[PDB]
Design a protein. Structure first.
Lengths: 147, 592, 118, 209, 78
RNA sequence: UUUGGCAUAGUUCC
DNA sequence: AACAGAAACAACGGGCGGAACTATGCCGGAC
DNA sequence: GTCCGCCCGTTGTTTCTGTT
């Protein structure tokens, strides 16, 4: 169809303990970043890369609706293991998941958002590099990727 | 050395990197050995379950447990597999002149007669006229058999499998009766002709006297009778073998005995025999061959792993590379992305003052002699791909007009300038998002040329006697010709067959479902047999044709393709107890 | 089946967007008949939609000017009228007619540059 | 293009002539063998705005055993043949007193039209053939052995000779390409004559069911 | 009118030999003069060679009919 | 002169 | 406008080698 | 002595055209 054909590729994230997929800009906004300039500072490190900017543009076109942390958290928490009958409990569940089950190795304290955002941006950046054919895809049989 | 070419022999020893590379090489062999076994066993089990109850009845027909005919004569001839031998026909390949000289029995020279036949027989031959008429009629029958053979066996293969080894029987007769080849014989060629005619009546496969039964017997013994007449020709007997009366009588007796012994015994379990005979090679077994190919052919899927479609050309396209490349272009799918160089969306409301300076002259010429939207869709076409496919910008423009109608505008440059330019303008619903959908559709849906679903098409001269065209010259020999043959990826058989300058007779694919839906059930049977023969004989192995024919008939007996799975096994109108023992027990029993 | 579905979805999308760009009264451009001095063959023919007599007369002048320039280089009306009429007869739509005329003009100019009579 | 359209019409006509010749109807040698230029001359070399307009190409021919039993070969001019078109064709057949007719379709027929074709089966027999299915003769392909339609007398004699009930023969679907080519109904038996590698010839039998 | 083959198939030969050997081993009269033999299988083979085995084979055609062939009438191939 | 079963692991042979 | 025939996509379920030989742990828990 | 990892045949859902 026409709209999918024009959009092309979109970037989505599968957070644990959540019913289905979430667009990445929603998660970044839920972390507390509103401005597209700031989100692109977290993702695209060198802004003199028009191909990367064009690749990330359709992901930002899903931010036409969501613009605030509260509504972003609501959207994330709507899809919990047991969806709530209220809204404050759903938003608290969303914050709890983004603070406890998303990237535990970065941190679990209250002020870990400033680093979780950077690491999630690094994941997205490496995905873009893979999609542009600038780094080789990993292989599971390589023994440096084993324990 | 870097990528693993071991320069040393096992006696000199391997340097450490070569040792590790050799271990990496041997691991693959160990893995294949440990992997193929279960799949081979499963294939053999499925075949056995499919054909476990097919038998040879006392009617001589081949029927399953429900008395449904599979073959009216086992192996289409009625003989047993373990009693037949390889033999040569010896009258198919020789030219006209050689054939006549070798099989004519000249009775006019009379010096060859005095040298080969006895004195009391040469006078009889030169005096009688009924003898001469019979001897000419024999050669007429041999010529007709030669034409029948050439129809049955194109590509000129003499090697064949028949029950009685006539040449070895003749050698045995010569040694048993102490025949001296340097002396004239006492065998009357009329006795030879009459003996062969009487012998052929005692080799009965289909018993009866109705026209239907006589036709069935003639069809059942045609090839062997042709071979018998070719071998026991009177001239060949007089020149080469030089038999005698008692020797010829003993030979006829031995032929009768061996033919009667080489007939299939009623009660044989030919279905299980065929299952084992086709499944035991599986344990030793750019396309797919071997175990995966056998799996695909047995359980037919509508999506083969590597579909292909070998295409033969009719005329001068077969020889000259020009029309060969032209057909190659005609039969390969190509959208606009395959030829486009770059594209862009501009904002240029001024027809005269154009943001791009290159189009100025011709865009002004177009606009000077006549609303519209101010947006643009400027695309650039790669010259190399544009000129490779022999495409033309007028052709692209008319294809765009056909695809979108006159609600678009199109202005195009020509190949004179170094930059080939196409400019498109439109003659909720905002322009930029509409132009991006126009570009996206026009680049992935245009279909400028080719046949859809045909991805890549190759073009190479054949190097095998089955993929080459073999004709018969005016002197009767077989001459092999090399003509260009195509080999595509992806299958759409009907369109390729309907294409101009494509041979509608020899064109074939390797998708069984496609062959079915295009050509029927008999064609699917023949094609399935050919594919099975190819996969089996890729390894140089040999399997008797009767087992192949039985498997193909079992699979295509009921008019539709019957995959050997639970679906096909339970589709049969058999008893529930046969189906319960195969891939579905409780469900079948409870349904019944 | 997916290609057929996508082609139908595209055609519906395209038709919707073009209907939103079609005004209520598409003024059918009135066909003005040729004048008494019109040198065009089949001048009154309405076979090509939206192709006017004045457009064909303009296209004919371009062919004459090109052929005149060619003859001046190599040391004409009848030939221009035949070239126009052949192009008219082969064309189905006005845009392709115009493009085939401009191609003939470019071919005449190429012959003139090469010092060849067209 | 006009050349390609003329070529397609000529190929369809030639295949239908071969089909009628195989079905036993009376088609002459000159009608069977027409060159492209001869067809261009006889019925227009220009299809678009020309004499051949998918009409006047309809063929009426009489069976070799009965001039009273005749067949039509109609060429609808519509990419999607409809109920009213089928009714028009049936009216023409009724007025000309014709039992059987062929219909070559540009692209396809609506399911409503197909069911309205099936409904009148005892009254009239009409068959649908696509434009793509007739650009080639499937019978001429080397993978397809010769088929012969057997009379009820031949069927009875065969069944008596082998002592077979018709359930015990191999089958062939009524939607088979060759079955549609020969126009065979359920209950008829076809005979397959093919060369063999181990016998030299082998005659099989198939029941249309 | 008998249409079945005039030879004795391997299966018929095997079953006839087994049944005749069992009959002899169950203390039944023989139809040949044994020249010193004692094994029932050997005696049965001797009888089959002599064409003295008193069995008639009932061959069932697939159409339900049948034909009775005596061992004396069937050509013994092997 | 009387008879346990379920699961997991390792090994032999094609 | 109501009805009906045919088709694209999605979800669900069954299917996956043959033999053979040793050993070891376990067969319900509280009151 | 009582309670506690991949393929592909079916069927559904939904959709898209034709008739009257």
């Amino acid at each position: 169809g026409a709209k999918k054909s024009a959009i092309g590729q979109r970037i989505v994230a599968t957070l644990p303990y959540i019913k289905q997929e979430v667009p990445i800009i929603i998660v970044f906004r839920a972390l507390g970043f509103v401005s597209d300039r700031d989100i692109l500072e977290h993702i695209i490190y060198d802004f003199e890369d028009p191909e990367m900017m064009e690749m990330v543009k359709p992901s930002l076109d899903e931010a036409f609706v969501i613009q605030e942390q509260n509504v972003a958290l609501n959207f994330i928490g709507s899809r919990g293991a047991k969806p709530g009958v209220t809204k404050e409990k759903r938003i608290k569940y969303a914050k709890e998941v983004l603070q406890k089950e998303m990237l535990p190795h970065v941190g679990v304290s209250d002020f870990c958002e400033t680093k979780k955002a950077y690491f999630l941006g690094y994941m997205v950046h490496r995905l873009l590099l893979a999609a542009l054919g600038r780094r080789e895809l990993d292989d599971r049989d390589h023994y440096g990727n084993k324990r | 050395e870097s990528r693993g070419f071991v320069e040393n022999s096992y006696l000199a020893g391997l340097t450490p990197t070569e040792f590790f590379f050799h271990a990496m090489g041997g691991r693959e062999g160990l893995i294949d050995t440990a992997v193929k076994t279960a799949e081979t066993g499963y294939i053999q089990r499925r075949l056995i379950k499919s054909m476990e109850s097919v038998m040879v009845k006392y009617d001589a027909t081949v029927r399953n447990s429900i008395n449904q005919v599979v073959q009216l004569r086992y192996g289409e001839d009625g003989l047993a597999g373990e009693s037949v031998e390889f033999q040569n026909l010896a009258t198919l390949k020789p030219s006209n002149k050689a054939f006549e000289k070798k099989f004519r029995f000249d009775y006019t020279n009379e010096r060859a007669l005095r040298r080969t036949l006895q004195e009391d027989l040469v006078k009889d031959v030169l005096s009688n006229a009924h003898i001469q008429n019979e001897l000419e009629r024999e050669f007429e029958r041999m010529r007709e058999d030669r034409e029948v053979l050439r129809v049955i066996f194109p590509t000129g293969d003499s090697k064949v499998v028949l029950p009685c080894n006539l040449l070895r029987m003749i050698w045995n007769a010569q040694k048993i009766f102490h025949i001296n080849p340097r002396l004239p014989s006492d065998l009357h060629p009329i006795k030879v002709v009459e003996g062969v005619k009487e012998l052929s009546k005692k080799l009965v496969i289909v018993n009866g006297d109705d026209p239907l039964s006589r036709q069935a017997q003639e069809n059942a013994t045609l090839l062997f009778n042709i071979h018998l007449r070719s071998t026991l020709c009177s001239r060949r007997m007089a020149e080469e073998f030089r038999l005698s009366g008692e020797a010829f009588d003993w030979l006829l007796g031995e032929i009768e005995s061996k033919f009667n012994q080489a007939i299939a015994h009623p009660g044989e379990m030919v279905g299980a025999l065929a299952a084992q005979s086709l499944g035991e090679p599986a344990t030793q077994m750019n396309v797919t061959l071997g175990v995966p190919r056998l799996k695909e052919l047995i359980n037919i899927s509508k999506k083969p792993k590597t579909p292909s479609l070998t295409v033969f050309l009719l005329g001068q396209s077969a020889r000259d590379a020009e029309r060969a490349k032209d057909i190659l272009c005609r039969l390969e799918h190509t959208t606009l992305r395959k030829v486009t160089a770059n594209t862009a969306i501009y904002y240029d409301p001024n027809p005269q003052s154009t943001v791009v300076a290159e189009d100025q002259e011709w865009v002004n010429v177009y606009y000077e002699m006549p609303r519209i939207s101010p947006w643009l869709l400027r695309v650039e076409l790669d010259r190399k791909h544009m000129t490779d496919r022999k495409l033309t910008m007028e052709q692209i423009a008319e294809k765009i007009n056909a695809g979108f109608g006159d609600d678009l505008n199109c202005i195009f440059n020509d190949d004179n300038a170094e930059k080939l330019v196409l400019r498109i303008r439109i003659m909720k619903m905002d322009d930029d998002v509409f132009l991006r959908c126009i570009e996206s559709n026009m680049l992935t849906d245009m279909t400028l040329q080719g046949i859809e679903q045909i991805s890549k098409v190759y073009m190479h001269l054949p190097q095998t006697d089955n993929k080459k065209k073999i004709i018969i010259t005016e002197d009767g020999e077989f001459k092999a010709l090399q003509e260009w043959i195509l080999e595509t990826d992806g299958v759409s058989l009907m369109r390729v067959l309907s294409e101009k300058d494509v041979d509608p007779v020899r064109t074939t694919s390797n998708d069984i479902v496609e062959i079915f839906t295009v050509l029927g059930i008999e064609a699917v049977r023949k094609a399935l047999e050919r594919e099975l023969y190819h996969v089996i004989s890729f390894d140089g192995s040999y399997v008797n044709y009767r087992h192949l024919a039985l498997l193909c008939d079992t699979m295509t007996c009921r008019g539709h393709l019957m995959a050997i799975t639970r679906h096909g096994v339970n589709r049969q109108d058999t008893g529930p107890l046969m189906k319960c023992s195969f891939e579905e027990t409780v469900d079948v029993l409870m349904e019944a | 089946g997916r290609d057929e579905a996508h082609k139908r979805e595209w055609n519906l999308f395209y038709q919707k967007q073009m209907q939103l760009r079609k005004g209520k009264d598409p003024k059918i451009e009135e066909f003005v008949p040729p004048d008494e001095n019109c040198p065009l063959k089949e001048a009154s023919s309405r076979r090509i939609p939206r192709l006017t007599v004045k457009a064909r007369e303009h296209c004919l002048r371009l062919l004459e000017e090109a052929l005149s320039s060619n003859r001046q280089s190599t040391r004409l009306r009848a030939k221009a009228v035949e070239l126009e009429h052949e192009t008219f007869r082969n064309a189905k739509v006005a845009n392709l007619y115009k493009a085939s005329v401009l191609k003939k003009v470019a071919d005449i100019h190429r012959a003139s540059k090469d010092g060849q009579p067209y | 293009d006009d050349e390609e359209e003329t070529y397609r019409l000529w190929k369809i006509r030639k295949t239908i002539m071969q089909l009628c010749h195989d079905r036993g109807y009376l088609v002459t040698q000159d009608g069977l063998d027409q060159t492209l230029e001869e067809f261009k001359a006889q019925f227009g070399g220009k299809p678009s705005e020309g004499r051949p307009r998918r009409t006047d190409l309809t063929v009426l021919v009489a069976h070799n055993d009965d001039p009273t039993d005749q067949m039509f070969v109609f060429f609808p001019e519509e990419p999607k043949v409809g109920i009213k078109t089928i009714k028009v064709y049936c009216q023409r057949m009724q007025e000309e007193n014709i039992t059987r007719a062929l219909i070559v379709v540009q692209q396809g027929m609506t399911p409503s039209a197909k069911q309205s074709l099936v409904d009148m089966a005892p009254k009239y027999i009409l068959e649908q053939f696509l434009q793509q299915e007739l650009l080639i003769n499937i019978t001429e392909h080397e993978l397809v052995p010769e088929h012969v339609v057997m009379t009820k007398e031949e069927v009875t004699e065969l069944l008596a000779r082998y002592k077979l009930r018709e359930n015990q023969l191999p089958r062939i679907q009524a939607g088979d390409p060759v079955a549609r080519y020969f126009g065979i109904k359920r209950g008829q038996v076809v005979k397959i004559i093919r060369p063999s590698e181990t016998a030299g010839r082998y005659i099989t039998y198939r029941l249309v069911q | 009118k008998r249409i079945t083959t005039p030879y004795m198939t391997k299966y018929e030969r095997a079953r006839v030999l087994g049944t005749r050997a069992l009959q002899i081993a169950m203390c039944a009269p023989v139809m040949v003069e044994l020249e010193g033999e004692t094994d029932p299988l050997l005696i049965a083979m001797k009888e089959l060679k002599a064409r003295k085995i008193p069995i008639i084979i009932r061959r069932y055609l697939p159409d339900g009919s049948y034909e009775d062939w005596g061992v004396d009438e069937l050509i013994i191939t092997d």
